[PDB]
Amino acid sequence: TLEKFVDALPIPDTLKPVQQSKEKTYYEVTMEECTHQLHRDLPPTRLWGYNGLFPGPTIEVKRNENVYVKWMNNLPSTHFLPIDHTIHEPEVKTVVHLHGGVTPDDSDGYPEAWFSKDFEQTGPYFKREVYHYPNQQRGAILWYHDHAMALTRLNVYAGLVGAYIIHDPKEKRLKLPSDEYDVPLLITDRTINEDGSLFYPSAPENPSPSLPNPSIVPAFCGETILVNGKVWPYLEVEPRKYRFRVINASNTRTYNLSLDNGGDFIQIGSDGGLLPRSVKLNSFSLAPAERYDIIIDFTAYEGESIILANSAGCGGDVNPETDANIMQFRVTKPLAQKDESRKPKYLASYPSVQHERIQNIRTLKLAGTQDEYGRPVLLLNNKRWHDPVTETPKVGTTEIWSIINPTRGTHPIHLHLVSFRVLDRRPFDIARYQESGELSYTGPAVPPPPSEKGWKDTIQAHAGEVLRIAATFGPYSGRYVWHCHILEHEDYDMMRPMDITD
């Protein structure tokens, strides 16, 4: 296996606007096939990258900054990963979703608003080439990635992911670590062939001859872990406080992170922004598309090498020599200045200060069926993506969504547009629910832990539990989506339209 910790962690450069004035900032980002070396001992890997970079450039904006991004497809007309034509026109379709963005619907990256190279062909919901992000929302770590219908798992795996940070100047007074000391960590698992090329399965193992070829698989677990486009990298840090924006940009894999010197993380933020109170943690779970905004204090660890370790399995127990490792910090960089940063306990208002009336309660089941080839098709409420819309909240109203998961694993559920509150999780009798549809609880409700007392947009719905969240659907109306963020599930067919009506 590749030798761990021999390449430095790349820090993606911050994108510079093509045009900028007090009234508007305009960016251009072009999707290109490109080659980059992913590890010291591999030949360069062919990838698809935003501005030909993997990951894409980090975009940084202010709260309320009037931003435009023209996302362009300059990719080849043929894909390089295995396309399964039986699950759903040009072969290569792309569209960019700013994950976490409070965004007008035609700029949200709807799966059917895709475009081919140079916008030659566009999907039925395409309206515009240049996307608009008003950023009228809390400071937070967002990220952007491909969202095209039936191809998201392939386009994202090819390398189409990047970070986007909204800075709210009202938070500057908190003195959180900043600038060179505020570093995004985009984690992506991959399997790489000897010749350096990416490997993505063209079918399940044990391929019944009843399967199409290629065939979609229900989950992808990569053999190697990359951070910011390098396999098991190291980062040299100064012995002081750093802020890390940790993003899970993997197709399926969930991580459970810790530090091998027993140090703590101080969580300061979740998907939707700063938590009301900082939270000291020895470990945390991070499923696909979730973000943790954390401080690590290396002050007392000068000279040490500390591994950011992983204990979550993917298709099996973790292997101590490979996927149990994410990256290595080396506390060997001399201090450039006094550490004037802080790790305050009091960070922001509690979401619970809000007292919205509950307009509606929706009950949603995570289910599925089996196709003519014997494969599982995962479905939200047993509806297909193409079935008539059923999730139709009224603009400005607040709803409780009750997500029932009778399946064997966790599904990370993402709602577009909004961030929401976690109310509680409660275990139920699976067999009974499956036989009769009756929901019978086997224990009391459990309120969220501190890490989930703030705002979330992608939320783990564990097996054998009902998860309740509360969301206010606004400020925009229109057609969005909600879906599982295991990409292999999303593309077949665990995604539904969401109409916020006026």
Residue closer to Cu ion (CB basis): 243 or 365: 365
State how far the alpha carbon of 378 is from the alpha carbons of 35, 203, 252, 286, in Å: 34, 17, 14, 22
Q: Binding pattern to Cu ion, positions 115-154, x when CB under 5 A?
A: ----------------------------------------
Q: Binding pattern to Cu ion, positions 436-475, x when CB under 5 A?
A: ----------------------------------------
Residue choice 489, 492, 495, 497 for contact with Cu ion (CB under 5 A): 489
Residue closer to Cu ion (CB basis): 147 or 489: 489
State how far the alpha carbon of 389 is from the alpha carbons of 123, 479, 492, 499, in Å: 18, 10, 17, 7
- Best CA proximity match to 249, nearest among 138, 159, 148, 140: 159
Residue closer to Cu ion (CB basis): 289 or 296: 289
380, 496 Cβ separation under 8 angstroms: yes
Residue choice 92, 216, 225, 484 for contact with Cu ion (CB under 5 A): 484
Kindly state the smallest distance separating residue 410's Cβ from Cu ion, in Å. Answer: 8
Q: Which stretch binds Cu ion (CB under 5 A): 37-45, 143-151, 265-273, 479-487?
A: 479-487
Q: How far apart are CA 249 and CA 410, in angstroms?
A: 17
Q: How far apart are CA 91 and CA 151, in angstroms?
A: 9
Q: Reduced to 3 states, what is the DSSP secondary structure of residue 451? A: helix
State CA 17 to chain mean position distance: 24
Kindly state the smallest distance separating residue 314's Cβ from Cu ion, in Å. Answer: 14
Considering the rule CB under 5 A, would residue 486 count as an interface residue with Cu ion? Answer: yes
Kindly state the smallest distance separating residue 409's Cβ from Cu ion, in Å. Answer: 8
264, 308 Cβ separation under 8 angstroms: no
Residue closer to Cu ion (CB basis): 7 or 391: 391
User: Does 462 belong to an annotated binding site?
Assistant: no
Q: Reduced to 3 states, what is the DSSP secondary structure of residue 2? A: coil
User: Does 386 belong to an annotated binding site?
Assistant: no
417, 109 Cβ separation under 8 angstroms: no
Q: Reduced to 3 states, what is the DSSP secondary structure of residue 119? A: helix
Total binding residues toward Cu ion, as defined by CB under 5 A:
4
E-state strands within 113-229 = 130-133, 140-146, 161-167, 182-192, 198-199, 224-227
User: Does 88 belong to an annotated binding site?
Assistant: no
Chain breaks in the chain following residues, C–N > 2.5 Å: 88
Residue closer to Cu ion (CB basis): 331 or 366: 366
Q: Binding pattern to Cu ion, positions 22-51, x when CB under 5 A?
A: ------------------------------
By DSSP bridging, strand 358-370 and strand 398-405 are parallel
Residue closer to Cu ion (CB basis): 411 or 479: 411
Q: How far apart are CA 450 and CA 265, in angstroms?
A: 13
Kindly state the smallest distance separating residue 378's Cβ from Cu ion, in Å. Answer: 6
Q: Which stretch binds Cu ion (CB under 5 A): 59-67, 318-326, 422-430, 488-496?
A: 488-496
The tokens for 353 are: 């200060």
Q: How far apart are CA 407 and CA 246, in angstroms?
A: 28
Residue closer to Cu ion (CB basis): 39 or 153: 153
Residues 6 or more apart whose CB falls under 8 angstroms from that of 264 comprise 280, 281, 282
- Amino acid found at 250: S
Kindly state the smallest distance separating residue 454's Cβ from Cu ion, in Å. Answer: 24
User: Does 414 belong to an annotated binding site?
Assistant: yes
Kindly state the smallest distance separating residue 484's Cβ from Cu ion, in Å. Answer: 3
Q: Among residue numbers 379 through 438, which ones bind Cu ion (CB under 5 A)?
A: 411
315, 201 Cβ separation under 8 angstroms: no
The tokens for 340 are: 């004037």
Q: Which stretch binds Cu ion (CB under 5 A): 105-113, 175-183, 463-471, 482-490?
A: 482-490
Kindly state the smallest distance separating residue 496's Cβ from Cu ion, in Å. Answer: 13
- Amino acid found at 69: V
The tokens for 109 are: 């990256």
User: Does 483 belong to an annotated binding site?
Assistant: yes
- Amino acid found at 29: V
The tokens for 413 are: 């559920």
Residue closer to Cu ion (CB basis): 287 or 327: 287
Kindly state the smallest distance separating residue 442's Cβ from Cu ion, in Å. Answer: 23
Residue closer to Cu ion (CB basis): 243 or 411: 411
Kindly state the smallest distance separating residue 327's Cβ from Cu ion, in Å. Answer: 27
The tokens for 320 are: 């101590």
Q: Which stretch binds Cu ion (CB under 5 A): 198-206, 323-331, 396-404, 489-497?
A: 489-497
113, 95 Cβ separation under 8 angstroms: yes
User: Does 39 belong to an annotated binding site?
Assistant: no
Kindly state the smallest distance separating residue 219's Cβ from Cu ion, in Å. Answer: 9
DSSP 464: T
Interface positions with Cu ion (CB under 5 A): 411, 484, 486, 489
Residues in binding site: 97, 99, 145, 147, 411, 414, 416, 483-485, 489, 494
Binding positions for Cu cation are 97, 99, 145, 147, 411, 414, 416, 483-485, 489, 494
